[PDB]
Amino acid sequence: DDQVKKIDKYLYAMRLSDETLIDIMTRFRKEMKNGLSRDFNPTATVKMLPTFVRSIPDGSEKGDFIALDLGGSSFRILRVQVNHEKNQNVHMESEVYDTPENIVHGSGSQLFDHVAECLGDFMEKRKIKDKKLPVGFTFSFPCQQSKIDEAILITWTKRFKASGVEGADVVKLLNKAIKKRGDYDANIVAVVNDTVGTMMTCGYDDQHCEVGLIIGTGTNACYMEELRHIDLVEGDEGRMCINTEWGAFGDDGSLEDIRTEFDREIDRGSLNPGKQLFEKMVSGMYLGELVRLILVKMAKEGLLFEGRITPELLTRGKFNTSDVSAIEKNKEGLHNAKEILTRLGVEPSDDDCVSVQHVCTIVSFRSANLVAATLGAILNRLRDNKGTPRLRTTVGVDGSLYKTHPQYSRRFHKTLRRLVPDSDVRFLLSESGSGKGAAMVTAVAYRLAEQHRQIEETLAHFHLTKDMLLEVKKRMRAEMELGLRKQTHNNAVVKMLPSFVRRTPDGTENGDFLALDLGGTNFRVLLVKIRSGKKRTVEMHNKIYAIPIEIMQGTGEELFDHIVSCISDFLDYMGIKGPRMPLGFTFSFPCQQTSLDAGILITWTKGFKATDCVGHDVVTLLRDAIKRREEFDLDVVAVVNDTVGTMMTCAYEEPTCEVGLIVGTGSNACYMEEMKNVEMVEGDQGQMCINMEWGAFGDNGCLDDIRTHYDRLVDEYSLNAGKQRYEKMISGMYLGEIVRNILIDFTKKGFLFRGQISETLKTRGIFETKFLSQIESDRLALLQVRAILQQLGLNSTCDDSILVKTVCGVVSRRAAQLCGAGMAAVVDKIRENRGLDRLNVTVGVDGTLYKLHPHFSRIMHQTVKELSPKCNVSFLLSEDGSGKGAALITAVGVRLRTE
Ligand SMILES: O=P(O)(O)OC[C@H]1O[C@@H](O)[C@H](O)[C@@H](O)[C@@H]1O
Ligand SMILES: O=P(O)(O)OC[C@H]1O[C@@H](O)[C@H](O)[C@@H](O)[C@@H]1O
Ligand SMILES: OC[C@H]1O[C@@H](O)[C@H](O)[C@@H](O)[C@@H]1O
Ligand SMILES: OC[C@H]1O[C@@H](O)[C@H](O)[C@@H](O)[C@@H]1O
Ligand SMILES: [Ca+2]
Ligand SMILES: [Ca+2]
């Protein structure tokens, strides 16, 4: 009676009080909070790692998979076949492989070579190599993952200690070993921790399973947490399984006041000193030795075996946990203790057999008790989440010590139910192992992988290689030439139309002028005053005037009548209504010029479609409308394209600006060609500004090489089917449509919005330049993206938002590259013309897409630099619009008219 009370006095420390157990519980409860927080997670010892598993099996799972189970006490590989659809129910055949204390403690390479060899043999014995069966990986160690098929080892635990693995991705490490074998092909689709596998398994049979617990070589647990609580995972919808990794509870020294010298000594001799402390007082890997450490400490004080101490009772690991168990059996309890203590050399007194066996209870009871305190903190967290007052949940379990020890299970549940009363908990023991559960995870993981494979295959067509970009640059140049050569100009797609502007501002332009800006997003009328010499200055006023789309696609009569009306009102506005002022007309469309004041509208582009305009001279068309009104009189000195207007605006300040570019509703470019190359205009003196009209590039098929199904659909439904193919893969008026069309397709395939094509998604023009630009902002957050989308009328989840943003990126990126390859061709021609080996030139730019988009310009500039390394281009943005440049052209126009 005192012997018992004798040891209960010695091992007093290892006798935890309920109030104490509650304390620890409260402590872990706080460790969980810190672990899940984005602010404190970096310092927490309890990792609370996300698993990317959002629900237990639903029953829809089916297929043939292979599972690997490394990290437990046995390396086992299994094959799980499941398919209710047809009729088949869950079936699985497993095999166990040996793993010597050599591989486990060797180099990661040696370890993964073994795992790859064992999997090979397994597939051979079943001759299933030919099948690309999905592989699930149950790796019972702490792992960092940003996705289910990635697992970076944080640190080894238990018996493993292989070099070159920590901090690496075991998936990649394993994939290498297999590939190095060339024997077969693996498709590792997921990596799960055993606590998650165990939970998945028990969940299959009990749809109330919300916890996975393991108590074997090591101890850990996982539970279903609310996504809105997992800070380190963007989303607030539903739940995800968190792998607590509580074995490291108190590694920051939060359980020093509970750890004994026996614990510390056990640690100082461990493989991983300082870590997994909480686990070192529980798991069956340490129970035995923790006891043999006291037996020695007792004998060393004559309290046992008559103070005798054999070399065996001193040798490490000579007292297995197996002993600790057999010695606690109810039947042959003490009888067993005798045989054991006997082989230990020491002479077992039938009184010793009693003293010993009791020690075992104390140690083996502390474990069961501790685990009950932490698991209790988890159940309390679940109860808190549900809001309910009571709690009903199932808990999956597995692990030697639990599965094979006479009293553990028993005492464990007891203390538990005692600690958490307001809850009804069922403990289901995984009889099958992790295999079933891993397979259940692999099924869904794989389901999402094919979806992904398909999405990527499609998007891959929007990816151009540097080599593809050089071809486009090449083609651009070939077409540039066909258009300049009078013999081939007749059937060239890039018309290279001359503008009849032969020099950038000289600095003598002086006067007052009116200007028109038609073609972009805003039709506006301006008044510009230029003063040079001493006081060189420019003063301009403008006013925007709408233009109903009806008029825009009405008749040339109403269109130009409307324009003149606006010109009138502005003349009043500025007051200057009276004299005969010279006017520059910026008409952003392809015109055939004979002189600075004659433009035959070759064809309409963008969204304009007025009747009886194509084929006429726009100057005239305007002149007439003016005569008809009879309210004033003007001097139309010039007609100008916005690209040329832009170039002049920027060249007014920057003398090296010899290129103009526009990337807004439509896209076009212009530059200064050598008069000797412009075979369409007599002379070979000086230079001339060439309005390329490069939007038509590809209208002869030269781009059908990289155009996609979505590009064709967008073209096929445009106002000008067949024309302006290049500009239609670049400008803000079309980008959106390419996207919409890609989205509708993904939706029909059931990859977006639950497969529902909404009315909004069917509305053309829905994706404005302004939206494409917000959605791609880098300062944006997923929550915000989803918000924007919902505002548009699209009911999108967070997963949806991610895919939409991606799609927008692929499309917008390709647009910038194609545009860069185009500009690259231009600058390199200007360099070859000037026979240079290096050319410095700046480009004048304008266009809403260019100005608002967060990445277009950057990726564009980058691409030009990469395709034309012999030119140092600079892009200067026009902030005053074309107007300034139109007036600066009108000035010369007049100067040459007066002369
Ligand atoms: O207690 P152990 O022998 O160490 O293993 C306990 C459990 O570990 C997991 O890693 C395995 O996936 C399970 O199959 C096993 O039941
Ligand atoms: O993006 P956009 O609306 O097409 O604008 C791009 C540019 O178009 C030209 O027609 C105007 O001369 C510019 O002032 C304007 O900045
Ligand atoms: O194998 C059960 C548990 O053992 C522990 O030592 C590891 O830290 C966990 O990753 C694992 O879940
Ligand atoms: O608006 C910018 C460009 O758009 C193109 O579609 C027009 O054909 C060009 O004349 C214009 O420079
Ligand atoms: Ca979250
Ligand atoms: Ca010429």
Distance 220 CA to ligand 3 centre (A): 5
Q: Is the separation of the CB atoms in 301 and 308 below 8 Å?
A: no
What's the CA gap between 512 and 582, in Å, rounded?
8
Count CB-CB contacts under 10 A for residue 38: 9
**367 counts as catalytic:** no
Residue 262 annotated in ligand binding: no
- Fold entry, domain 498-655+879-899: Nucleotidyltransferase; domain 5 (3.30.420)
With the most atoms of ligand 2 within 8 angstroms of its CB, the residue from 521, 522, 643 to mutate is: 521
CB of 357 closer than 6 A to ligand 4? no
**796 counts as catalytic:** no
Nearest C-alpha neighbor of 172 from the set 158, 191, 155: 191
User: CB neighbours of 257 closer than 8 A, spacing ≥ 6?
Assistant: none
Measuring CA to CA, how many Å separate 145 from each of 148, 165, 172, 177, 233?
A: 7, 15, 13, 21, 11
Looking from the CA of residue 848, the nearest atom of ligand 2 is 1
Distance 673 CA to ligand 6 centre (A): 10
Query: Residues 566-594, buried b or exposed e (16+ Cβ, 10 A)?
Result: bbbebbeeeeeeeeebbbbbbbbbbbebe
661 φ/ψ angles, rounded to the nearest 5 degrees: -145, 145
- β partners of residue 531: 537
Looking from the CA of residue 588, the nearest atom of ligand 4 is 10
Resolution in Å, one decimal place: 2.8
Q: Whose CA is nearest to atom 10 of ligand 4?
A: 589
Distance 74 CA to ligand 1 centre (A): 7
What's the CA gap between 33 and 40, in Å, rounded?
9
Q: Is the separation of the CB atoms in 788 and 771 below 8 Å?
A: yes
329 φ/ψ angles, rounded to the nearest 5 degrees: -55, 150
Residue 588 annotated in ligand binding: yes
User: Among 259, 366, 381, 524, which one carries the catalytic annotation?
Assistant: 524
Q: Is the separation of the CB atoms in 202 and 138 below 8 Å?
A: no
Ligand nearest to the CA of 518: 2
Looking from the CA of residue 662, the nearest atom of ligand 4 is 2
Looking from the CA of residue 434, the nearest atom of ligand 1 is 12
Residues at Cβ < 5 Å from ligand 5 ion: 230, 233
Nearest C-alpha neighbor of 232 from the set 43, 382, 37, 51: 37
Residues at Cβ < 5 Å from ligand 6 ion: 678
Method: X-ray
Q: Is the separation of the CB atoms in 46 and 248 below 8 Å?
A: yes
CB of 519 closer than 6 A to ligand 2? yes
At 220, which helix (H) or strand (E)?
strand 219-226
- For the chain, give every domain's residue range: 1-38+208-430, 39-207+431-448, 466-497+656-877, 498-655+879-899
Comparing 39-207+431-448 with 498-655+879-899, is the CATH topology the same?
yes
- Fold entry, domain 1-38+208-430: Hexokinase; domain 1 (3.40.367)
Residue 120, Ramachandran bin (φ over 0: left; ψ between -120 and 50: alpha; else beta): alpha
Q: Which residue type occupies 630?
A: E
User: Among 588, 801, 857, 868, which one carries the catalytic annotation?
Assistant: 588
What's the CA gap between 131 and 123, in Å, rounded?
9
Task: Please return the burial class of 5, using the count of CB atoms within 10 Å of its CB with bins 0-12, 13-18 and 19+.
Answer: exposed
Nearest C-alpha neighbor of 56 from the set 576, 438, 588: 438
Measuring CA to CA, how many Å separate 723 from each of 374, 378, 720, 768, 883?
A: 70, 65, 6, 22, 28
Count CB-CB contacts under 10 A for residue 756: 11
From the candidate CATH numbers 1.10.760.10, 3.40.228.10, 3.30.360.10, 3.30.420.40, the one assigned to the domain spanning 39-207+431-448:
3.30.420.40
Do strands 135-139 and 63-70 pair parallel, antiparallel, or not at all (unpaired)?
Answer: parallel
Do strands 49-50 and 239-243 pair parallel, antiparallel, or not at all (unpaired)?
Answer: antiparallel
432 DSSP 8-state letter: S
**642 counts as catalytic:** yes
Q: Is the separation of the CB atoms in 496 and 592 below 8 Å?
A: no
Measuring CA to CA, how many Å separate 225 from each of 59, 348, 455?
A: 22, 52, 30
756 φ/ψ angles, rounded to the nearest 5 degrees: -100, 120
With the most atoms of ligand 1 within 8 angstroms of its CB, the residue from 77, 214, 403 to mutate is: 214
What CATH code is assigned to 466-497+656-877? 3.40.367.20
The helix-helix angle for 735-748 and 435-459 (nearest 10°) equals 150
Looking from the CA of residue 158, the nearest atom of ligand 3 is 6
330 DSSP 8-state letter: S
CB of 122 closer than 6 A to ligand 4? no
Q: Is the separation of the CB atoms in 11 and 301 below 8 Å?
A: no
Pocket of ligand 3 (CB under 6 A): 71-72, 140-142, 157-158, 193-195, 214, 218, 220, 245, 247, 279
Nearest C-alpha neighbor of 808 from the set 738, 729, 733: 738
Torsion angle of C-alpha atoms 830, 836, 837, 843, degrees rounded to 10: -40
CB of 590 closer than 6 A to ligand 4? yes
Residue 667 annotated in ligand binding: yes
Residue 703 annotated in ligand binding: no
Residue 660, Ramachandran bin (φ over 0: left; ψ between -120 and 50: alpha; else beta): beta
With the most atoms of ligand 3 within 8 angstroms of its CB, the residue from 74, 193, 402, 403 to mutate is: 193
Ligand nearest to the CA of 400: 1
Residue 248, SS3 per DSSP:
helix
